[PDB]
Amino acid sequence: PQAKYRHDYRAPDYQITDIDLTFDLDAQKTVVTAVSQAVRHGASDAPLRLNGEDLKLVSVHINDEPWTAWKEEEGALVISNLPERFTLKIINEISPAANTALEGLYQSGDALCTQCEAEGFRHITYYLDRPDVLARFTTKIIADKIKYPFLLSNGNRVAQGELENGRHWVQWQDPFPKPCYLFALVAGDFDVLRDTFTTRSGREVALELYVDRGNLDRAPWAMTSLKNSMKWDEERFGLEYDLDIYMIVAVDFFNMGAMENKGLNIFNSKYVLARTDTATDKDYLDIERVIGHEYFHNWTGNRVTCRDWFQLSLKEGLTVFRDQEFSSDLGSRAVNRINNVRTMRGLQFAEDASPMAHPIRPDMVIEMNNFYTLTVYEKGAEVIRMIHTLLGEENFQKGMQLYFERHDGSAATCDDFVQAMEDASNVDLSHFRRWYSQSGTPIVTVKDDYNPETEQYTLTISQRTPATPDQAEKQPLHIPFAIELYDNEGKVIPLQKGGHPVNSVLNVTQAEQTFVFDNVYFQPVPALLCEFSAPVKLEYKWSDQQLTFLMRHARNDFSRWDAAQSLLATYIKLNVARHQQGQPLSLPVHVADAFRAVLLDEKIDPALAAEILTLPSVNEMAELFDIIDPIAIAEVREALTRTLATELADELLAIYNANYQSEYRVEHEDIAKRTLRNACLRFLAFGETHLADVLVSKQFHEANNMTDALAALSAAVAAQLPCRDALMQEYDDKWHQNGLVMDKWFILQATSPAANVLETVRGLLQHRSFTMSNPNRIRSLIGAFAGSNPAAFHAEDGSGYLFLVEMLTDLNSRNPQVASRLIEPLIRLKRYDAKRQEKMRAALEQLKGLENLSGDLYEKITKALA
Ligand SMILES: N[C@@H](CCC(=O)O)C(=O)O
Ligand SMILES: N[C@@H](CCC(=O)O)C(=O)O
Ligand code: NA
Ligand code: NA
Ligand code: NA
Ligand code: NA
Ligand code: NA
Ligand code: NA
Ligand code: NA
Ligand code: NA
Ligand code: NA
Ligand code: NA
Ligand SMILES: [Zn+2]
């Protein structure tokens, strides 16, 4: 399979302006009639090249003439000798029930639904399946009335009828031109939650949430979140919804999270369904974020779309930024920022050092579904947030307004967006654009000097990005480097130079530069890279006391958390090296004392405390090392947990008890208290066994909400407490019929520290609640094993790799998109020791030899084996 390149972009030879679709729907055989109005833009002799995959062509007409000048080739229908303007009519057949890849039109239980992003519409009919071709759609759906009483597509209902033999039909029209990736169709039998939102200018919008029969009890929070999203976009961005109806359909079988099809969003039911006994606080907040995200795409993605798929971050970085801002404004900004930073340093940085490393605007792609990445999404958003840091809110909004004023109704590029921001603000972003074209994580080194004779503080800041597997050449970036200088009392020292204030966002644009501040009356403790102002690794030689001082005094909550992370990083690294030499954990008393102070500080927000008392994950730990030892990292994380549990035992119990709440509420103060309480419980579970067992078992049995029940269960598994098997069986017996609730339990099984975890995981392939046909179950069992239990995945006998090869051998044929997400832990082999690399390479070579290797896997495997 052949790579496509960003520099090869060219405007299409033909446009389509209007398309009228009819579906004669049936799960075994659907007949699609597509009537497109086309216009030639290129040369008179250019054929029209339509994309199409796995279609059965029935007929081709041009202005009602059966056409003879065409041919089928791999992936395409090529139609020659055309007039300049014409009506194209294609009839073809497809088979939804055979669609195990869940791309195009497929079956989700008894429903039929679509997923067209990125290139799935070509699995439905022959089309210009590229996002710079925008057309007005009309969609008629004909189906069995008993099986498919609801027939939905984008926009509004314009026609409806009944036919003989128990069939009926509905026709839909959407007045906004769209690229075909935004097409959707749903047919099925649903319960429907109906509500309304009135926009600020008085437009009344009907809201309709479709769920499987019996799930209306789990719909109101998603409805509430949709209304919150619509109100927020109006308040913060000035943006209103532009249609009459907003439909969301929750489906169980879906490869991603959710999809922003105009007026008809299709969601993985994981990001819709919640009630207090089934969903944790984190599930509530994830439903909120994803609901918001898809809603925000209505402007950033739908009203202004992407010229080509290389511009994916134009809509994804910006929409992720918007969903973070939404979450942050409604909830705890510090907790949101901390968690996004954990993702960036712990998961995205690992991608940026991998064989799959790419810039947020990629230059080369084999399979575009492989580029729905942490880089494009999360790093994309950090790039948008850097623009915001450089411009300020008011200028940023002016940019947003100019972007829409120029580009509403069209496809655009990342470069168009940056240009709107530059032109509206008058800030120069020429150099800043390099963030779109350069891959890898920059390393920013800082040295300081305090001169008591002159009362000057000098920062010498350097940057470099190491070469990555995709790019040998790297250059300096425009890095917004936020600082704050603290005096010995903890007060902020005004930044200034030559008797003028200096902005606290430094522009670090060179390989090396110095910044000099005057009137620095006391040797400062610096807070560096405040609020993770750029997505970089920071190298500064902190003393432990500087870091504990920031923990006690820093103004921004994030800086207090970040200082704690830097304090812990030193001791993680220490203790991994010790573990490799057979030595036990060593931790200075003053480190333990710093975390004790956080536990007992009455003035700290409990949301912040809880994050400081949540140890970095094994993934965030791995990013501290050049060569990863996953066994050592897992045992050190445990040992550190046990050490803190012993040293802070009485304080932990005291805080655990003080944060008890009898009422359950999905409200941010209550969530914060509960996150603190459960963070205490996690340490307590690793303390003295008897007390641990009693506390955990009681919380599980007495909990009045899944957040508390699951925190207890998860602690029982992690600390291997006596009560573990009994609690795990109670949960299975109670919840086995509910796939989303069982996903939590599969994650716990997959991530268990027990010596026989792989044997248990293999056995769960036959569990009553598991099926290989459901991407959520695959992710929760197999994916959590490979990705979230690196100690077991990387067992020295190589068994983890062999298990993954076997699963991937099935998934390569069944669902390649899911296969390709799941291969990710194997393509990281160069981070591991030689004996592990050798085994991982042999696993990859076995996969490279599969019959009918999918393009999705081929791309990752070839880069990994290079
Ligand atoms: N554009 C969707 C994801 C669809 C996909 O992965 O294809 C979103 O980010 O919300
Ligand atoms: N799971 C324990 C630490 C052991 C480990 O994470 O490897 C905890 O989460 O608190
Ligand atoms: Na068009
Ligand atoms: Na139309
Ligand atoms: Na907030
Ligand atoms: Na594909
Ligand atoms: Na410029
Ligand atoms: Na210094
Ligand atoms: Na220093
Ligand atoms: Na840090
Ligand atoms: Na822990
Ligand atoms: Na099963
Ligand atoms: Zn998105």
Side-chain angles (χ1 to χ4, degrees):
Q2 206 35 60
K4 191 155 175 196
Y5 296 91
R6 185 170 63 85
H7 60 252
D8 289 331
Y9 175 82
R10 299 295 182 271
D13 283 333
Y14 291 84
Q15 275 289 354
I16 291 173
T17 65
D18 299 271
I19 175 163
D20 204 275
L21 288 164
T22 300
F23 292 80
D24 202 318
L25 278 185
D26 169 89
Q28 301 309 310
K29 186 209 283 179
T30 291
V31 182
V32 185
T33 302
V35 180
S36 294
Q37 315 304 148
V39 182
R40 183 154 61 234
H41 286 237
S44 97
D45 62 352
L48 161 69
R49 306 188 170 265
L50 294 175
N51 313 108
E53 296 287 351
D54 307 310
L55 307 177
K56 178 180 176 177
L57 185 62
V58 175
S59 67
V60 187
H61 292 68
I62 299 292
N63 295 329
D64 297 315
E65 169 71 358
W67 200 246
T68 56
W70 61 270
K71 55 183 157 85
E72 278 175 301
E73 318 205 297
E74 191 155 292
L77 171 57
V78 182
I79 302 174
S80 295
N81 307 327
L82 288 163
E84 194 184 23
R85 297 177 125 87
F86 53 92
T87 304
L88 172 64
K89 179 172 162 269
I90 296 284
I91 301 180
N92 63 269
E93 299 175 0
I94 55 185
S95 183
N99 194 338
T100 62
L102 315 187
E103 178 179 29
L105 178 65
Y106 67 94
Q107 181 171 58
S108 178
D110 294 324
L112 297 170
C113 62
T114 55
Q115 172 57 36
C116 297
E117 190 182 357
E119 295 174 326
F121 187 77
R122 70 189 62 184
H123 295 252
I124 298 180
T125 192
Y126 278 110
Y127 198 71
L128 295 173
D129 186 3
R130 54 181 287 164
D132 59 347
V133 171
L134 286 84
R136 287 176 289 272
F137 282 67
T138 298
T139 303
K140 175 170 165 166
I141 315 170
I142 309 161
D144 190 73
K145 202 181 171 175
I146 287 167
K147 199 173 278 133
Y148 308 108
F150 296 90
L151 307 176
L152 315 179
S153 186
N154 308 84
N156 292 307
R157 290 181 191 76
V158 293
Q160 298 170 242
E162 292 264 308
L163 303 163
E164 37 155 29
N165 297 318
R167 293 159 81 234
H168 71 138
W169 64 268
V170 179
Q171 187 179 48
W172 294 83
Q173 206 158 79
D174 173 355
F176 287 95
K178 60 167 165 290
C180 64
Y181 78 90
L182 286 172
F183 174 76
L185 177 152
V186 175
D189 185 26
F190 299 103
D191 277 324
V192 187
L193 179 64
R194 297 174 194 281
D195 205 333
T196 73
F197 180 85
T198 297
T199 75
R200 110 189 142 164
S201 65
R203 176 183 216 122
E204 199 186 73
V205 184
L207 309 179
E208 297 177 354
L209 175 52
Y210 298 77
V211 305
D212 286 342
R213 294 289 186 182
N215 286 325
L216 282 172
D217 63 322
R218 288 201 285 172
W221 167 249
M223 182 65 78
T224 299
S225 299
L226 176 58
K227 295 190 287 190
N228 291 334
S229 294
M230 294 177 79
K231 187 70 161 72
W232 179 91
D233 217 6
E234 289 182 342
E235 291 176 2
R236 186 74 183 276
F237 280 82
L239 301 170
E240 294 188 17
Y241 192 59
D242 55 351
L243 290 172
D244 313 285
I245 307 177
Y246 200 105
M247 300 178 276
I248 296 172
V249 178
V251 298
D252 292 340
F253 290 85
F254 198 74
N255 290 335
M256 310 292 302
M259 178 65 211
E260 72 266 22
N261 315 295
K262 183 77 170 188
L264 180 56
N265 296 173
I266 292 167
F267 273 58
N268 188 315
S269 55
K270 190 172 42 150
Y271 297 110
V272 178
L273 306 174
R275 60 180 205 270
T276 60
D277 51 311
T278 69
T280 63
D281 291 328
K282 174 206 144 64
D283 297 330
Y284 279 91
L285 296 179
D286 280 341
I287 291 157
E288 177 184 78
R289 140 181 93 83
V290 173
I291 294 274
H293 184 93
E294 307 310 333
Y295 183 72
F296 305 144
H297 269 308
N298 193 50
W299 285 93
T300 51
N302 303 0
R303 286 288 289 266
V304 178
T305 195
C306 295
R307 189 193 72 175
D308 60 67
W309 289 121
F310 304 97
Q311 325 292 323
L312 179 63
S313 202
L314 174 70
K315 72 184 182 72
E316 301 302 340
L318 184 52
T319 306
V320 171
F321 176 75
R322 285 157 46 65
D323 88 48
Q324 290 179 2
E325 289 302 294
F326 170 60
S327 296
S328 299
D329 277 354
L330 274 57
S332 174
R333 176 162 288 283
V335 169
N336 276 282
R337 186 72 188 132
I338 292 160
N339 286 316
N340 296 322
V341 176
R342 291 180 178 283
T343 294
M344 278 294 299
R345 292 177 173 156
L347 301 176
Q348 196 276 331
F349 281 14
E351 178 174 74
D352 241 342
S354 82
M356 268 283 302
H358 48 285
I360 61 167
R361 180 184 59 205
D363 289 329
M364 173 192 166
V365 167
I366 298 178
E367 166 51 65
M368 186 57 210
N369 293 319
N370 288 338
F371 289 81
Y372 286 76
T373 58
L374 289 162
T375 295
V376 170
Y377 279 65
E378 311 306 320
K379 186 174 171 176
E382 300 295 306
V383 173
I384 298 309
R385 187 178 296 284
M386 286 188 282
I387 297 171
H388 185 271
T389 295
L390 295 169
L391 271 59
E393 176 77 11
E394 181 184 306
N395 278 325
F396 185 89
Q397 289 306 337
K398 293 200 276 248
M400 288 302 299
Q401 290 161 24
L402 185 56
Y403 174 65
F404 292 128
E405 177 172 53
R406 292 180 174 168
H407 306 285
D408 188 3
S410 79
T413 65
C414 298
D415 192 69
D416 296 323
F417 177 81
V418 173
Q419 204 191 318
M421 287 285 173
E422 176 175 74
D423 290 346
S425 66
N426 310 118
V427 173
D428 175 22
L429 300 173
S430 296
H431 187 191
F432 188 85
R433 283 172 177 78
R434 186 166 302 127
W435 283 108
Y436 286 80
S437 58
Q438 187 167 288
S439 57
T441 314
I443 307 171
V444 176
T445 299
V446 178
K447 296 173 216 302
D448 61 2
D449 172 68
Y450 180 68
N451 183 334
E453 293 188 44
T454 59
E455 296 195 8
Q456 286 177 325
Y457 180 65
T458 302
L459 293 171
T460 301
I461 302 182
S462 57
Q463 60 170 300
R464 51 180 310 266
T465 301
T468 53
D470 64 312
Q471 285 186 341
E473 195 237 5
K474 302 292 181 181
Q475 298 183 266
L477 299 168
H478 178 171
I479 295 175
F481 194 88
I483 66 166
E484 196 146 272
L485 301 179
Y486 292 92
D487 74 16
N488 52 323
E489 301 185 340
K491 299 159 188 297
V492 181
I493 297 160
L495 297 184
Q496 59 170 297
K497 198 196 182 160
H500 307 307
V502 164
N503 195 275
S504 72
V505 181
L506 316 183
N507 289 294
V508 168
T509 59
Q510 294 179 229
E512 182 147 311
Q513 55 257 279
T514 69
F515 300 83
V516 183
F517 304 89
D518 296 284
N519 296 280
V520 184
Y521 55 78
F522 201 89
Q523 174 177 313
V525 181
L528 302 175
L529 202 76
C530 301
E531 298 197 74
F532 191 65
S533 64
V536 305
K537 291 155 184 283
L538 176 65
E539 277 183 1
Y540 176 81
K541 196 185 142 163
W542 291 108
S543 73
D544 290 3
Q545 292 183 298
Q546 289 177 311
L547 293 169
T548 62
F549 179 97
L550 293 176
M551 291 174 59
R552 290 191 306 278
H553 298 291
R555 256 180 18 195
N556 199 304
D557 285 6
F558 172 90
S559 301
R560 295 196 171 210
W561 175 82
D562 198 28
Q565 303 317 105
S566 293
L567 181 65
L568 288 170
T570 297
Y571 297 103
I572 291 159
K573 283 193 272 203
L574 177 66
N575 285 298
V576 164
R578 286 177 61 77
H579 182 271
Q580 292 173 332
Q581 288 319 314
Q583 284 133 15
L585 191 95
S586 173
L587 190 73
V589 166
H590 66 264
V591 178
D593 286 342
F595 289 86
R596 191 190 325 278
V598 170
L599 273 172
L600 299 174
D601 186 346
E602 333 220 34
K603 295 192 157 173
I604 184 172
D605 182 343
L608 172 67
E611 295 312 322
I612 293 172
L613 297 163
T614 299
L615 297 185
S617 67
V618 297
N619 300 119
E620 303 173 68
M621 286 165 87
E623 175 269 333
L624 300 172
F625 297 96
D626 295 326
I627 299 298
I628 301 167
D629 184 338
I631 301 180
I633 287 168
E635 312 266 21
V636 168
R637 190 174 192 271
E638 182 181 336
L640 180 55
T641 300
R642 287 188 189 279
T643 297
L644 290 169
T646 301
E647 295 304 309
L648 304 177
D650 294 326
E651 298 88 344
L652 287 164
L653 186 64
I655 299 304
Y656 175 77
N657 293 145
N659 284 283
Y660 175 76
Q661 288 178 102
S662 50
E663 288 279 4
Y664 184 78
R665 300 184 187 87
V666 183
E667 284 171 27
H668 297 284
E669 293 191 354
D670 291 36
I671 292 159
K673 291 171 54 163
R674 181 160 47 254
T675 304
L676 178 59
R677 186 162 184 265
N678 292 329
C680 298
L681 181 71
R682 190 65 170 199
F683 286 110
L684 289 165
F686 282 92
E688 193 267 313
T689 296
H690 186 249
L691 175 57
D693 206 62
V694 165
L695 288 175
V696 160
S697 181
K698 182 175 192 289
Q699 174 161 320
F700 181 81
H701 288 132
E702 292 179 10
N704 69 352
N705 67 86
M706 183 54 93
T707 300
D708 291 336
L710 192 76
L713 187 64
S714 178
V717 178
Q720 303 176 82
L721 305 173
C723 69
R724 177 199 67 206
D725 295 339
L727 308 191
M728 287 292 281
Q729 183 68 50
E730 291 166 38
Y731 188 111
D732 186 350
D733 287 335
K734 181 177 183 184
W735 291 119
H736 62 97
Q737 69 297 332
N738 187 322
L740 297 174
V741 174
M742 286 311 287
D743 283 341
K744 295 164 184 330
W745 184 96
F746 292 126
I747 291 169
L748 297 184
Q749 296 282 27
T751 59
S752 167
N756 64 336
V757 60
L758 178 56
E759 186 197 344
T760 296
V761 169
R762 279 189 177 276
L764 292 172
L765 300 172
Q766 302 322 308
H767 189 280
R768 57 186 162 174
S769 312
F770 184 79
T771 171
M772 287 300 277
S773 64
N774 182 289
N776 291 338
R777 307 299 95 79
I778 291 161
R779 188 211 208 177
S780 297
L781 180 63
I782 301 165
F785 177 77
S788 308
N789 198 340
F793 178 62
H794 287 287
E796 296 196 18
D797 61 11
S799 58
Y801 318 131
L802 292 186
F803 173 62
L804 188 68
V805 165
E806 197 187 326
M807 292 307 96
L808 291 171
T809 296
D810 167 317
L811 293 166
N812 173 78
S813 302
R814 184 197 300 263
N815 189 332
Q817 286 184 51
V818 175
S820 180
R821 300 229 95 115
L822 236 55
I823 203 167
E824 204 75 7
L826 211 49
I827 72 159
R828 308 295 177 74
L829 76 173
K830 298 287 195 58
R831 295 296 299 291
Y832 294 87
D833 66 71
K835 179 191 199 303
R836 292 187 169 102
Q837 286 188 42
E838 196 184 337
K839 302 181 196 267
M840 287 168 81
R841 193 165 279 118
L844 293 165
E845 276 155 3
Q846 207 181 317
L847 296 169
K848 194 191 167 74
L850 287 172
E851 268 177 37
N852 305 134
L853 181 62
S854 62
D856 308 62
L857 298 188
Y858 172 82
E859 181 165 30
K860 299 197 162 171
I861 294 165
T862 59
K863 289 174 198 292
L865 287 178

